[PDB]
C-alpha cells in the first residue's frame, strides 16, 4: 500500500478502516 | 504515539494496525 | 445536545469530536 | 454495546463521552 | 467535553452533530 | 452534475461544497 | 423538505444551491 | 463569527450550540 | 456555485459528489 | 486488515487511504 | 463491480488496491 | 493536474467535472 500524513478525524477514520471489528484505541497523549 | 508516527511523521496501513485491539 | 443515530465510521467521527485530546476507545461487539 | 446502540437505536453525546480515555 | 480547532467541512460536521433536528446556520462571513 | 442521494451528515458535506464562503442553512423537518 | 428529499429520493446540486446564504 | 470562534480560535461543543436554530 | 481549496480526502469526496455514476479518476502525479 | 462494508462516499474514502499518491479510479456500474 | 460488491456484500483492502493507478 | 488546480490553487465544481469519466 502507501504511507501518508493521517491527522485528526482522518487518523481515526483510517484506524476504523484498518481495525474494523477488532476495535482500536486512539490515544494522542500517548 | 500514533500522532507522532502517523500525523507528524508518515505511517503505513500496517503501522496503523499497531493500534487495533 | 440532541440524540444521535450513528453507524459505521459516523460513530468514530462523533467519538473524535466528543473526546478531543483525551482520545477514546472503539469497541464493537464480536 | 455503544457501537450497536447508536446504530440500531439512538445514543447521546453524554453516553459517548463514557468511551473517552 | 473538550475544545478543539474545527475548520471547513469538519466545522459543519460538528454543527450537524451538536444541532441535529434543530438545524443550524453556517455563516462564515459572519 | 449528477443527481444525488444524500442522508445524514452527507447532506451537510454536499451543502458545504456547494455553498463555499456563502455558507448555508440546514433545516430538517420536525 | 430538502433534507428529507435528498435522503428518501434524490436531489440535485442546483436544488441544494437554494439553501446557500 | 463561527470561524473565528471555532477554527481560528478553539471552541467547545456548547459554544457550537450557539449556531443551532 | 463557488471556488474553494479542496485537498486530500476532501478533493476525492468533491469528485464523488460532482461525478457520481459517471465515475472519475484521481491522479495526483498528474 | 479486516473486510469492509462500504457504500457511497465511504468507498471513495477507503480507496483514497489505500492508494495514496498513486491515486485511483472510481467506476460504478451503469 | 467493486463499487457494488463493497456495498451489497463485503470487500477487502487487497481487492480495493486493484483500483489504484 | 487536479492537485495543482484544486488544492494548491482554487477550483470550481465545473472544473472538477474535468476529472469525471
Ligand atoms: Cl484538514
Ligand atoms: Cl451512510
Ligand atoms: Zn455515511
Ligand atoms: Zn479534513
Amino acid at each position: 500500500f502507501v504511507n501518508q500524513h493521517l491527522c485528526g478525524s482522518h487518523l481515526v477514520e483510517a484506524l476504523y478502516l484498518v481495525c474494523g471489528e477488532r476495535g482500536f484505541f486512539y490515544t494522542p497523549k500517548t | 504515539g500514533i500522532v507522532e508516527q502517523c500525523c507528524t511523521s508518515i505511517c503505513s496501513l500496517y503501522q496503523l494496525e499497531n493500534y487495533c485491539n
Side-chain angles (χ1 to χ4, degrees), chain A, chain B:
Chain A
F1 298 88
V2 295
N3 309 351
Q4 33 171 73
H5 289 102
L6 287 168
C7 297
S9 69
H10 303 290
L11 179 52
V12 300
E13 298 260 356
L15 281 173
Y16 174 75
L17 202 324
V18 167
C19 304
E21 59 196 293
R22 297 177 268 192
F24 62 82
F25 51 96
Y26 173 61
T27 50
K29 309 272 316 144
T30 266
Chain B
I2 193 175
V3 177
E4 290 84 35
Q5 291 307 313
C6 296
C7 175
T8 309
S9 189
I10 202 215
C11 71
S12 64
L13 270 20
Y14 304 88
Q15 275 162 284
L16 282 178
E17 287 192 304
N18 300 327
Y19 311 90
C20 301
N21 284 334

